[PDB]
Ligand binder design. Structure first.
Ligand SMILES: NC(=O)C1=CN([C@@H]2O[C@H](COP(=O)(O)OP(=O)(O)OC[C@H]3O[C@@H](n4cnc5c(N)ncnc54)[C@H](OP(=O)(O)O)[C@@H]3O)[C@@H](O)[C@H]2O)C=CC1
Ligand SMILES: [Zn+2]
Lengths: 134, 206, 114, 125, 288, 94, 386, 82, 146
């Protein structure tokens, strides 16, 4: 187990459902011996003799740019095209539609409150679940 | 009105008239003249005018500001010239006070006013020490308030309140040593400003 | 880009003052070691002078150089006139400071600072 | 008489700041978001510069929050974004600028509360 | 690790090093450097002392508020030993005396007391144990001091098998009884600097490898005793039967034992620090 | 309402007590842990509920200007008492 | 030869510590180079992190022999920027305790000057009087020295019943105490030998070197801010300004002794002319409401809450406000940026310019005279270093 | 061995017109030929177009495509694939 | 309100399995050395990674770069998106291309197999804002949720 940082404890990049890149900021440092997640992997790479070519948050973000330039255009929605090309490729292999009706995982509010590790560990979310079931 | 400070229009008018007087005589240097609502006259000048303007105010027969009350600086980082040099002068003959202001940045020196007022000697050492403003032709410019070897200029807005180093006695080397500052209790920053405007008369244009 | 000079009108004039100040500091070190009864050697003292000068070697603004020389002269005057004490002179050497980690792994083990 | 200097303005060597707190800090230039608990907007007028948050730990004796970061409380105010960026540049601080967020102008109409055929009709007052 | 002893900070006075150390013999020559180094980095230090509180005052400024805790203790009272080590993660034994007294002989200070400390530390669950012996410890020495050092060195290992035993040569420093001893008045000596010994002790605490090992802390160079005494008198610009016997014992060479180099410490030359020690009293060829 | 933990250390009115493996309890060795014995939560629970006639009552903590700011307490609910938010005194409509 | 004076005398002294580096030729002093900053505590920077109320106690600790006078200077500056006016009774109280503070300062100035010159006994007699005046401070504020009593808007609390009677009983006997002091010093030929023609400064030089207070009037300059630029109710009391003729240490000593007598004369009028009424401005957006109101009225509670957390906002502006403090002109250049915390607060300490003139005044004098000249300037390093 | 191809281009700049034309016409054919080769197309405003090829063990090369034609892009990919 | 989860069940120390098969605290040096020894012994398809739902891009690229250096391309996510056709070749294939603010301009919205009220509450509120002020027409295929 390698203790990593939570989203309140690091400056990290997340892309939302529309493709917009945004970054968190450090509010508090990680607890105990926990460490920034990308730094753990960078430290692991060196000990294993496969050192990664970036030593700072800025440098790993320069790397992000090499792989996808939109990932460092913070707060911008770039916009993607070529729907026709994607549509032309989805018509090749013909997959069959199952007979099961479409049921979303969350049908009522009781399913909304706990969905990830943070909210599952939250005592307030546990009180909300208890409230909307009793 | 018991709680409101009374106005004095007579002094406001006198100071305004003298403000124009100074501007008419020193147009080479004077950039702005204003009189505050509590009757204080400020002459804003180009830094080249420090010696001519101060000399005029000291020696002119209608001025006679023989006493330098205070000489200080103010740091406003958002200004291209962040430092504002403020001279507070007093005239015993005319029982009046005037304020003269100029500006400079980190690298532009200001002429020492020691030739006009001997009082300026230490005031300028303090401004150099606390703000890092260099005064040209100062007889003995050096720190006055800070410790020997102190780095930085503590009264700059971007200098941290607790500084960068702190002292303690170390038994191993048998002397007082300087080390990077660590605080058992960090100073607790407070956000006090109300989100509601207080003084409409000073509202800036959008 | 038209500015009031401090002392030197160009880098060549500024570099003359830098060399003059280095000469004064270089000759002062033996006296400083004796006057303050320092446990460091004269070579260590002169190496410290070189290191402090070297760290500013990249400056290209004559006004900034003037200020650095102005401050360096002030520091020398404090040392020669013995306004400084033994502690002030030895503050250049950070003897009680434990070496701080330089490489990525060492920093990673000890904290979150870059 | 004036001289000519074409160098980019840089004062890092004459500010007295330790190198650690110039080269490893990240300044953030922004207009603070309105405190959502209040409607006043007077605190969203000026530009601000803060630095990256660093470690705070519990003092063993009292449990007070200790720090080793000399910039932990440093907040600077600027009239414009350019003033803030200029100040960061000459001080050698690497910086991030975030564009000012301005509330979008809205279309309000008290009459719409009582629409004859639209969903804007309110069911209570 | 208990959450309270996870390291925090930047290694300074207000930081938390995670070290909770009980230092027996802290009021002596070696103890003041060990406590200072522990306090420099924000360790919790328990200082059991036999002396008057007035004689512990020089230790007070060495730690942040609350980081130095003083206790009374008696060498022959095991309950007082237990109270001191009960909450510590390391116990450092610097107890010793260069002479015998009516109430305490060399067997008391170098055998009975170290054994009692080690035993109570093990019974208290203490994880680490640092014990200072002597390079020239031997059960065949003409010196009763060095004979007792050998017997106690054996009992500590038996009682606390994971103990880190350190065997320094004669230590020189401002408060030593070596260079000061000569300035106040065949054999080969390898004196070692006090700060090097202190740094090695601090590193043995932080180094998991040092557990169960025996170290020999010696200086860089070996000096014929005559050359050393002449050098001291030059720099200075100028006792008991046991102490003379110890001073005339040639420093044992033990290449099998790890030294300061294994703990990351660079031995300080005597010539670099000789003036520091002897300045208040106002170069010897080495043996390759 | 003081109580001693299994190690014998008293628990404060805020619930604080060093746990078993906490070195920090070494500070109390040879000294003592200052603990106030008059737990306010227990003392305010001994006060009787005050029976009043009106729907709304006011409390200022007693002593006029030496008490707390005067607040008014609604007593409509019959399932519970009205509790003063400053001093904890309870009221009930009779 | 080069010589450094000791930090302070070997008896209790409360002026602070000074490093005086001197150049001597035989007995004569050729150069004086005071090295200050030994009590520099960055007060002016700390104030920028305080509300206007939170910064007020810092002024007690500047010239910490003239506490309430420093409070008055800061209060007047904030009142000017606030554009409000303290009520008449508060103004009389401020003048009354301003002159009690002048007595406190002049006893310290005159008697420690004598004590350093070797005349120990008057210090003991007159510090019993200081102890009784400390009781007046303590009875109005609860503190003997750093009262924090005078605040923008007025004073913190009204005088307790019976205090003015006790101030009258004290004042009734004080002139006799001054007479005993003058019996020891005024005509003493040893005292005159240590002070007459020592540290002479011309009227012209005193002005250009930035001097103020007794350092000006000792040289014949007819100037006193209480007369020329009156504040509070100083225009309503009668008193004379003592003026020197020789500009030396002896004349300045006579000026300070006579000023003590005039302070008693002013205190007498204050005790008789004290009006009734409230003691802080009746504007709860500046001065907190009474505790009974705060505990009863919704508006009062809000304003109490806001004044003690955010503090009052001050309209943007800058002022230089000065008073005739016991040591000279004490002023503040106070800059407000519109918020509840001052943007800049420069403090003008009269002893700063006076000490800068030590080298000028000591020329052609002997080493022992340097002690006399420092005493005649009445230097406290809390205000010099700030 | 080749492991991944990335093409970066701008949505509007003339310098990426040739890359835009390639994706319009050739990309679908390319994908059919190499079904299990990830060809990551990533548009971002005001970037000079580039072709990244990632080989085994994380070895990567990049080729500029600024002002290229659709055929010059086709040859650039032909070089990379083989 | 879920931020209090950040105060519970936290991983604060590196842990490894001991002789009994139980997790025990250790140092960063020991834990990383153990993982490094395995990463140097395995290659290709013998090394894989799964990324959870709260992982950041900087960690994501770092882990991809590390695994690529043993020639492993089994970098997976828990959330499934079909790889048929273009898959993730074209960003438009897996984005909300209209943008959240773009809902305010639409005149018809078809929701297919989803409960945006709980999947994306702030996106569902944008639909209701358009439903309210623009008279937006909304149709759903899937369970008749509210
Ligand atoms: N200095 C050297 O050259 C060398 C030293 N060592 C070892 O290092 C350790 C300390 O060295 P140093 O510090 O110089 O020795 P010191 O004599 O300077 O300090 C001795 C310490 O032991 C304590 N002590 C002595 N006798 C007793 C006793 N009977 N009961 C309780 N406490 C006692 C003293 O406490 P109090 O102050 O109350 O007497 C003091 O704190 C010793 O074990 C010594 O043998 C090993 C090799 C060389
Ligand atoms: Zn109540």
């Amino acid at each position: 187990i390698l203790p990593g940082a939570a989203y309140t404890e690091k400056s990290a990049t997340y892309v939302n459902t529309e493709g917009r890149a945004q970054q968190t900021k450090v509010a508090v440092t990680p607890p105990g011996l926990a460490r920034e997640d990308w730094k753990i992997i960078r430290a692991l790479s060196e000990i294993a003799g496969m050192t990664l070519p970036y030593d700072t948050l800025d440098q790993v973000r320069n790397r992000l740019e090499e792989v996808s330039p939109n990932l460092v255009r913070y707060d911008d929605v770039e916009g993607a095209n070529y729907f026709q090309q994607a549509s032309e490729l989805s018509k090749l292999v013909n997959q069959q539609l199952l007979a099961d009706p479409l049921v979303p995982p969350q049908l009522t509010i009781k399913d909304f409150y706990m969905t990830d590790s943070i909210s599952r560990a939250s005592q307030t979310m546990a009180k909300c679940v208890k409230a909307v079931t009793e | 009105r018991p709680t409101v400070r009374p106005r004095n229009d007579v002094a406001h008018k006198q100071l305004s008239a003298f403000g124009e007087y100074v501007a008419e005589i020193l147009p080479k240097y004077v950039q702005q003249v204003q009189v505050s609502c509590f009757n204080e006259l400020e002459i804003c000048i180009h830094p080249d005018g420090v010696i001519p303007v101060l000399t005029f105010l000291r020696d002119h027969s209608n001025a006679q500001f023989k006493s330098l009350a205070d000489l200080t600086a103010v740091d406003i980082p958002t200004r291209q010239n962040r430092f504002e040099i403020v001279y507070n002068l007093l005239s015993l003959r005319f029982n009046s006070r005037i304020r003269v202001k100029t500006y400079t940045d980190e690298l532009t020196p200001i002429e020492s006013s020691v030739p006009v007022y001997k009082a300026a000697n230490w005031y300028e050492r303090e401004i150099w020490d606390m703000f890092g403003v260099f005064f040209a032709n100062h007889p003995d410019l050096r720190r006055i308030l800070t410790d020997y070897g102190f780095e930085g200029h503590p009264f700059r807005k971007d200098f941290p309140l607790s500084g960068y180093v702190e002292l303690r006695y170390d038994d191993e080397v048998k002397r007082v040593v300087a080390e990077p500052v660590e605080l058992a209790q960090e100073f607790r920053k407070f956000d006090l400003n109300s989100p509601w405007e207080a003084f409409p008369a000073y509202r800036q244009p959008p | 880009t038209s500015v009031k000079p401090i002392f030197s009108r160009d880098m060549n004039e500024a570099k003359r003052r830098v060399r003059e100040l280095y000469r004064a500091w270089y000759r002062e070190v033996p006296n400083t070691v004796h006057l303050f009864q320092l446990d460091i050697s004269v070579k260590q003292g002169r190496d410290k002078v070189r290191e402090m000068f070297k760290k500013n070697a990249h400056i290209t603004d004559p006004r900034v150089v003037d200020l650095l020389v102005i401050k360096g002269k002030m520091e020398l005057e404090e040392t020669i006139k013995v306004w400084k004490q033994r502690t002030h002179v030895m503050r250049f050497f950070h003897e009680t400071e434990a070496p701080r980690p330089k490489d990525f792994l060492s920093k990673f083990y000890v904290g979150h600072d870059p | 008489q004036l001289i000519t200097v074409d160098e980019k303005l840089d004062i890092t060597t004459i500010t007295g700041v330790p190198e650690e707190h110039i080269k490893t800090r990240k300044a953030r230039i922004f207009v603070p978001a309105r405190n959502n608990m209040q409607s006043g907007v007077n605190n969203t007028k000026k530009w601000k510069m803060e630095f990256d948050t660093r470690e705070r730990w519990e003092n063993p004796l009292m449990g007070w929050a200790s720090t080793a970061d000399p910039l932990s409380n440093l907040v600077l105010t600027f009239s414009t974004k350019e003033d803030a960026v200029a100040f960061a540049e000459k001080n050698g601080w690497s910086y991030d600028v975030e564009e000012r967020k301005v509330p979008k102008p809205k279309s309000k109409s008290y009459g719409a509360n009582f629409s004859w055929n639209k969903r804007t009709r309110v069911s209570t007052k | 690790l208990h959450h309270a002893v996870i390291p925090h900070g930047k290694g300074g006075r207000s930081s938390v090093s995670g070290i909770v150390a009980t230092v027996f013999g802290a009021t002596g020559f070696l103890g003041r450097y060990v406590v200072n180094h522990l306090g420099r980095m924000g360790s919790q230090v328990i200082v059991p002392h036999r002396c008057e509180p007035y004689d512990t005052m020089h230790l007070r400024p060495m730690g942040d508020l609350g980081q130095i805790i003083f206790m009374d203790w008696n060498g022959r009272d095991k309950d007082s030993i237990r109270r001191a080590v009960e909450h510590s993660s390391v116990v450092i034994n610097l107890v010793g005396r260069e002479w015998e007294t009516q109430n305490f002989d060399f067997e008391d200070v170098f055998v009975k007391i170290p054994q009692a400390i080690a035993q109570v530390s093990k019974e208290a669950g203490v994880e680490k144990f640092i014990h200072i012996s002597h390079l020239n410890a031997d059960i065949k020495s003409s010196s009763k001091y060095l004979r007792s050092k050998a017997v106690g060195e054996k009992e500590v290992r038996e009682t606390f098998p994971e103990a880190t035993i350190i065997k320094p040569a004669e230590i020189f420093g401002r408060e030593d009884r070596f260079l000061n001893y000569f300035a106040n008045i065949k054999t080969v000596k390898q004196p070692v600097y006090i700060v090097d010994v202190t740094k090695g002790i601090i590193n043995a605490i932080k180094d998991p490898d040092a557990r169960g090992k025996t170290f020999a802390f010696v200086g860089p160079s070996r000096y014929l005793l005559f050359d050393l005494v002449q050098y001291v008198f030059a720099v200075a610009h100028r006792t008991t039967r046991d102490k003379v016997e110890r001073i005339h014992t040639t420093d044992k060479i033990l290449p099998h034992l790890p030294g300061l180099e294994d703990l990351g410490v660079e031995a300080t030359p005597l010539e670099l620090k000789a003036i520091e020690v002897l300045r208040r009293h106002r170069p010897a060829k080495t043996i390759p | 309402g003081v109580r001693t933990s299994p190690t014998g250390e008293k628990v404060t009115h805020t619930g604080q007590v060093y746990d078993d493996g906490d070195y920090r309890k070494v500070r109390f060795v040879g000294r003592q842990k200052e603990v106030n014995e008059n737990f306010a939560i227990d003392l305010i629970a001994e006060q009787p509920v005050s029976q009043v006639g009106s729907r709304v009552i006011s409390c200022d903590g007693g002593g006029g200007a030496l008490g707390h700011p005067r607040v008014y307490i609604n007593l409509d609910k019959e399932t519970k008492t009205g509790t003063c938010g400053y001093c904890g005194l309870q009221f009930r409509q009779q | 030869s080069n010589l450094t004076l000791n930090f302070g005398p070997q008896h209790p002294a409360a002026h602070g510590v000074l490093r005086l580096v001197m150049e001597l030729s035989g007995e004569m002093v050729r150069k004086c180079d005071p090295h200050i900053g030994l009590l520099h505590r960055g007060t002016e920077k700390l104030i920028e992190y305080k509300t206007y109320l939170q910064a007020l106690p810092y002024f007690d600790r500047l010239d910490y022999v003239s506490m309430m006078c420093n409070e008055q200077a800061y209060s007047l500056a904030v009142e000017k920027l606030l554009n409000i006016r303290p009520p008449p009774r508060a103004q009389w109280i401020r003048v009354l305790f301003g002159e009690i503070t002048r007595l406190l300062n002049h006893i310290m100035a005159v008697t420690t000057h004598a004590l350093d010159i070797g005349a120990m006994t008057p210090f003991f007699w007159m510090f019993e009087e200081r102890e009784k005046m400390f009781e007046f401070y303590e009875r109005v504020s609860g503190a003997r020295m750093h009262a924090a009593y005078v605040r923008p808007g007025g004073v913190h609390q009204d005088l307790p019943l019976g205090l003015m009677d006790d101030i009258y009983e004290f004042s009734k006997n004080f002139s006799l105490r001054i007479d005993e002091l003058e019996e020891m010093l005024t005509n003493n030929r040893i005292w005159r030998n240590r002070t007459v023609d020592i540290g002479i400064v011309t009227a012209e030089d005193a002005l250009n070197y930035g001097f103020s207070g007794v350092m000006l009037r000792g040289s014949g300059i007819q100037w006193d801010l209480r007369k020329t630029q009156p504040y509070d109710v100083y225009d309503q009391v009668e008193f004379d300004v003592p003026i020197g003729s020789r500009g030396d240490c002896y004349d300045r000593y006579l000026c300070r002794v006579e000023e003590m007598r005039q302070s008693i004369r002013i205190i007498s009028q204050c005790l008789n002319k004290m009006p009734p009424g409230e003691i802080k401005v009746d504007d709860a957006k500046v001065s907190p409401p009474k505790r009974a109101e705060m505990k009863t009225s919704m508006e009062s509670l809000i304003h109490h809450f806001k004044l003690y957390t955010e503090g009052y906002q001050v309209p943007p502006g800058a002022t230089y406000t000065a008073i005739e403090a016991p040591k000279g002109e004490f002023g503040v250049y106070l800059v407000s940026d519109g918020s509840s915390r001052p943007y800049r607060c420069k403090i003008k300490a009269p002893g700063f310019a006076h000490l800068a003139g030590l080298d000028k005044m000591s020329k052609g004098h002997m080493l022992a005279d340097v002690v006399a000249i420092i005493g005649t300037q009445d230097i406290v390093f809390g205000e010099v270093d700030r | 061995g080749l492991r991944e191809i990335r093409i970066h281009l701008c949505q509007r700049s003339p310098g990426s017109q040739g890359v835009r034309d390639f994706i319009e016409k050739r990309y679908v054919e390319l994908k059919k030929a190499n079904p299990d080769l990830p060809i990551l197309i990533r548009e971002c405003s005001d970037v000079q177009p580039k072709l990244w090829a990632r080989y085994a063990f994380g070895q990567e090369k990049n080729v500029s495509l600024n002002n290229f034609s659709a055929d010059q892009v086709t040859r650039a990919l032909e070089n990379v694939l083989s | 309100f879920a931020y209090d989860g950040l105060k519970r069940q936290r991983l604060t120390e590196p842990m490894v399995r001991n002789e009994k098969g139980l997790l025990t605290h250790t140092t960063w040096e020991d834990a990383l050395s153990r993982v490094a020894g395995m990463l140097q012994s395995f290659q290709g398809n013998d090394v894989a990674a799964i990324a959870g739902g709260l992982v950041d891009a900087e960690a994501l690229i770092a882990l991809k770069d590390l695994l690529n250096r043993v020639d492993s391309d089994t970098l997976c996510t828990e959330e499934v998106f079909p790889t048929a056709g273009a898959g993730t070749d074209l960003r438009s294939n897996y984005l909300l291309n209209t943008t959240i603010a773009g809902v305010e301009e639409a005149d018809v919205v078809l929701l297919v197999g989803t409960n945006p009220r709980f999947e994306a509450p702030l996106f569902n509120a944008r639909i209701r804002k358009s439903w309210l002020h623009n008279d937006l027409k909304v149709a759903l295929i899937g369970s008749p949720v509210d």
